[PDB]
Design a binder for this molecule. Structure first.
Ligand SMILES: Nc1ncnc2c1ncn2[C@@H]1O[C@H](COP(=O)(O)OP(=O)(O)OP(=O)(O)O)[C@@H](O)[C@H]1O
Ligand SMILES: [Cl-]
Lengths: 85, 929
């Protein structure tokens, strides 16, 4: 784990970008920046999944089970209605 | 100048009448003659009372739940109006709402009309159904349609509190004459009497509020706790709250008991809860869920054919090229399998089709976005809420009582269900006090959202016997302020007593100590500000460094730096200006937080919670602390487990240094040499000396004493604040703003100093769908004269496109030439508004126009097919379509404006602009009409 390093790396400031660091592979949260306040600012770091998307579309060609059609009209206010896993 | 009388009624229904104070209250009179209208069913007590009000020629506001049967009152009034040969206009808020009412009214009464921006049918009908916004324009025109009208009906009047369109309801009411009588249909609101007093005050006649909590089909509400074996009945059929179930359901969340929506849906079909509406607050979530349901098929083959005949049948009008669209094609299998989706993003031809299908019974499950509740009411037997919590865009919150009330009011079908079932899926612990409010709480008060608009102002100047100022004075907004004054006074006194009751901090000198500590906090923030300046912090932004992130009240505690980048502003509403420094930091975020994709949604873990590490990029100024410690970081942070590892590491350092993990000194370590910080440091050092001198610090029970001082301080702020609110008691709140607008209008040349509308002003009246001030000014700068027809319409997309899309497409000069041109024009107006003392900021006005669909609209305009244009942008199809629909709307507003200033060329360029734009699926109308 931990260590204490009190030592500045001037490159980041001089060169405008990180120097002296090992960068991890990570997925960031979204596309914006937390601080940005009025959103009078926007930045670009620079893949949809909609219903008509191909991955989705082949799921419907593939069939599915039909559970219950037509017993009675309905059933009172029963305190616990279970539902199996 | 108004009094209220309460009148006795029977079956848990309330009747009160507000009358002008100088008139004696007289009991309503029993009907002479036969009823104007007769119904199939036996009327409810609330309906009868209201009906009697109409018989007696007095106005009534009926406030009852959705599906209670508010609509009959309106019908009876039309019947009465028609019977006496006078006219009636029934208005609805949305176009969708109006069409449904047009038809509904058409069946009962033969002579009916529909007036919408888009359609006009039977305009001189005895009963005319119109959108309220159209009605406002009619009042402005001074039209003949209002001439034989005796009654106006406002249905779903409780949408008046909506911010954008709320004002039009108020404005319409103000414009209408005293001679007219009204029937108000609304949902249950707490302040129903208040609204009725305003009508009486404004119209100098009685208005009755008839209120009932009756629900024809009762509901039983359930909460399913995630990871729970089953649903629990939190509220009964009788409207009672069962805490034991709530607590029991809640404990399961604690996991001390001893959550798919797929599962909930499966039981409903199994237990013949059958048609169900599933509510999700994300468009994407609604769709995601729907697919999941595709594994099971809920339809018989006879129904499967039925789905296809109607679907296909609706679709026949659509061009074959439009019919082959992916958006159209992929939907059909879902429908065939009994699944539907309904959200803002989807196409309108399909939207309506699903609504038709649901009504036929072909659709067993509907996963719809939150605005389905705000739609033509189609009820369902069961309602499922996928989440109890919502994202505001700023903070996470639970759904409000009004929010619950609307969505859960979609459950239960009058003819068809003995009970309605509402299900709440809940992922976070909920308190009993918090839970009780959600379910058994009241609806939102109909509070007005009147605001000043230039079109309102201009049009009022234009009209002869009214002024802009008159509208303000007679508004509901003003009425509420006046009426609420008694409370403000009461709050002050009560708050004042509170200060005295708690004015027993034992020695009065603690106020001085508190001020010392308060000063330290203020200074402490001043130190931090220097530490997160880019020059000083960039040097230390090394991976694995421990840093604290706090963002306007939600503070995340300790995080580790993962990476840093410098980014440039791509706003581009305003100028690029400065570049922003973003640091990507692994923070401990909420379970709720991780579920939201958006960057803005990140929030710190709750006290109960474990938390989860996410790397979220934050701006440089949000880091409140930087430390010496640097820690080892695994090199793939993608896995939860690997990211989780940092949390353990963070605690290992926390355990190791329990006096606080170490921070770098600004000068000793950061080296910031700014002289001003030293002063802050000195001043902080000084107060520390003062702080320790004080006796209080050392004294035991200091915390108890200080807390009173904080409490005492809070009341004073509230007392002062209330006193400020009281100071504005005798003043018209928005009048100052009107005058500021009026000054702007004069400077810009729209109107004269003596308030006579001028020719520039007259053109502007027509434009009510967008920023009229700019467009006429742009017209008067001749910007439109030299434009491409496609450019002319594409430029206007910015006037009416409001949705949030990630980014614009680079544009060929013909499209962006005007873009450059408008912004300067926009900038000029902005300069003058600020000059006139208004509140706006230049970056914001300039960036309030969105050019994101500029290309797309042009491309559509030139003859491109709809399918092609969808490729270009990431905003959904419905959103795209919506913007275009408003675009036609705007062009008509623009077309008319040109006639006023007599440019035939301009009329035609705009009028032929519509024709390029208005074609095929985008303009269909299948919602049967
Ligand atoms: N006494 C009654 N007996 C049977 N059905 C009734 C009765 N009163 C109303 N209804 C039915 O109630 C349903 C709902 O009425 P309506 O649509 O006017 O409801 P609402 O919620 O009050 O109004 P809105 O349309 O403004 O939301 C209608 O289908 C109507 O036929
Ligand atoms: Cl992670």
């Amino acid at each position: 784990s931990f260590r204490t390093d009190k030592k500045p790396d001037p490159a980041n400031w001089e060169y405008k970008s990180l120097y002296r660091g090992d960068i991890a592979r990570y997925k960031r949260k979204g596309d914006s920046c937390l601080g940005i306040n009025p959103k009078k600012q926007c930045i670009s770091w620079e893949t949809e999944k909609k219903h008509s998307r191909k991955q989705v579309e082949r799921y419907f060609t593939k069939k599915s089970v039909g559970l219950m059609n037509i017993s009675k009209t309905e059933p009172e206010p029963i305190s616990f209605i279970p539902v199996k896993d | 100048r108004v009094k209220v009388q309460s009148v006795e009624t029977v079956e848990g229904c309330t009747h009160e009448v507000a009358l002008p104070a100088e008139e004696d209250y007289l009991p309503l009179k029993p009907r002479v003659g036969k009823a104007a209208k007769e119904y199939p069913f036996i009327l409810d007590a609330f309906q009868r009372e209201a009906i009697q009000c109409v018989d007696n020629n007095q106005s009534v506001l009926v406030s009852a739940h959705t599906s209670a049967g508010k609509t009959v009152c309106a019908e009876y009034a039309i019947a009465l109006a028609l019977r006496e040969k006078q006219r009636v206009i029934f208005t609805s808020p949305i176009k969708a709402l109006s069409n449904q009412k047009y038809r509904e009214m058409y069946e009962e009464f033969q002579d009916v009309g529909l007036m919408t921006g888009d359609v006009t049918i039977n305009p001189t009908a005895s009963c005319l159904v119109m959108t309220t916004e159209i009605l406002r324009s009619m009042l402005y025109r001074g039209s003949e349609v209002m001439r034989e009208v005796a009654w106006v009906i406002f249905d779903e009047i409780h949408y008046m509190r909506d911010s954008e369109r709320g004002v039009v309801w108020e404005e319409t009411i103000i414009l209408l004459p005293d001679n007219v009588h009204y029937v108000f249909l609304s949902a249950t609101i707490p302040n129903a009497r208040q609204f009725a007093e305003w009508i009486c005050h404004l119209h100098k006649q009685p208005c009755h509020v008839i209120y009932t909590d009756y629900r024809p089909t009762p509901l039983q509400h359930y909460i399913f706790p995630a990871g729970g074996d089953g649903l629990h009945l939190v509220v009964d059929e009788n409207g009672d709250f069962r805490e034991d179930n709530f607590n029991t359901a809640m404990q399961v969340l604690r996991d001390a008991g001893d959550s798919n929506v797929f599962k909930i849906v499966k039981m409903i079909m199994e237990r013949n809860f059958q048609p169900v509406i599933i509510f999700s607050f994300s468009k994407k979530d609604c769709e995601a869920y729907a697919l999941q349901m595709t594994k099971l098929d809920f339809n018989t083959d006879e129904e499967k054919k039925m789905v296809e005949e109607v679907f296909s049948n609706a679709i026949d009008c659509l061009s074959d090229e439009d019919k082959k669209l992916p958006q159209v094609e992929h939907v059909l299998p879902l429908l065939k399998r009994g699944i539907g989706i309904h959200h803002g993003g989807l196409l309108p031809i399909l939207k309506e089709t699903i609504e038709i299908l649901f009504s036929e019974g072909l659709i067993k499950a509907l996963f719809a976005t939150e605005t389905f509740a705000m739609g033509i009411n189609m009820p369902a037997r069961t309602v499922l809420f996928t989440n109890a919590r919502k994202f505001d865009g700023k903070d996470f919150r639970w759904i409000s009582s009004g929010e619950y009330i609307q969505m859960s009011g979609r459950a239960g079908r009058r003819g068809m269900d003995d009970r309605g079932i509402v299900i709440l899926m809940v992922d976070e612990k909920m308190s009993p006090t918090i839970g009780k409010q959600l379910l058994k709480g009241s609806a939102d008060p109909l509070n007005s959202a009147f605001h000043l608009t230039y079109n309102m102002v201009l049009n009022l100047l234009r009209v002869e016997e009214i002024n802009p100022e008159y509208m303000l004075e007679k508004s509901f907004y003003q009425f509420q302020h006046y009426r609420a004054i008694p409370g403000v006074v009461e709050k002050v006194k009560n708050s004042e007593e509170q200060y005295n009751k708690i004015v027993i901090p034992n020695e009065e000198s603690v106020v001085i100590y508190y001020k010392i500590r308060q000063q330290l906090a203020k200074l402490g923030k001043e130190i931090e500000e220097y530490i997160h300046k880019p020059k000083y912090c960039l040097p230390f932004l090394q991976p694995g460094r421990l840093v604290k992130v706090k963002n306007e009240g939600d503070d995340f505690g300790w995080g580790v730096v993962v990476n840093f980048s410098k980014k440039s502003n791509v706003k581009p509403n305003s100028g690029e200006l400065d570049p922003l420094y973003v640091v990507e930091v692994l923070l401990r975020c909420s379970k709720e937080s991780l579920k939201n994709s958006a960057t803005e949604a990140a929030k710190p873990a709750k006290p109960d919670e474990k938390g989860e590490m996410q790397v979220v990029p934050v701006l440089v100024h949000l880091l409140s602390a930087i430390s010496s410690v640097r820690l080892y970081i695994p090199k793939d942070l993608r896995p939860v487990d690997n990211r989780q590892s940092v949390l353990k590491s963070i605690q290992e350092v926390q355990k190791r240094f329990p006096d606080g993990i170490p921070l770098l000194d600004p000068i000793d370590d950061m080296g910031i040499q700014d002289q001003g910080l030293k002063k802050v440091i000195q001043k902080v050092e000084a107060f520390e000396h003062r702080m320790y001198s004080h006796p209080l610090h050392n004294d035991p029970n200091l915390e108890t004493v200080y807390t009173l001082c904080e409490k005492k301080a809070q009341i004073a702020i509230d007392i002062k604040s209330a006193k400020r609110e009281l100071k504005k008691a005798r003043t018209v709140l928005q009048m100052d703003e009107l005058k500021c607008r009026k000054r702007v209008l004069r400077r810009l040349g729209f109107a004269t100093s003596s308030d006579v509308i001028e020719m520039k002003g007259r053109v502007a009246c027509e434009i009510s769908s967008a920023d009229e001030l700019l467009l006429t000014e742009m017209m008067f700068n001749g910007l439109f004269n030299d434009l491409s027809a496609e450019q002319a319409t594409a430029l206007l997309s910015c006037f009416v496109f409001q949705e949030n899309s990630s980014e614009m497409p680079k544009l060929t000069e013909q499209l962006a030439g005007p873009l450059r041109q408008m912004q300067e024009c926009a900038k000029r107006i902005a300069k003058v508004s600020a000059e006139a003392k208004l509140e706006i900021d230049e970056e914001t006005y300039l960036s309030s126009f969105k050019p994101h669909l500029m290309d797309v609209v042009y491309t559509w305009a030139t003859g491109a097919t709809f399918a092609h244009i969808c490729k270009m942008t990431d905003v959904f199809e419905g959103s795209i379509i919506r913007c275009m629909r408003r675009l036609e709307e705007l062009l008509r507003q623009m077309c008319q404006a040109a006639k006023a200033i007599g440019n035939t060329e301009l009329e035609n360029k705009f009028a032929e602009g519509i024709t390029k734009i208005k074609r095929d699926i985008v303009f269909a109308a299948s919602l049967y009409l």
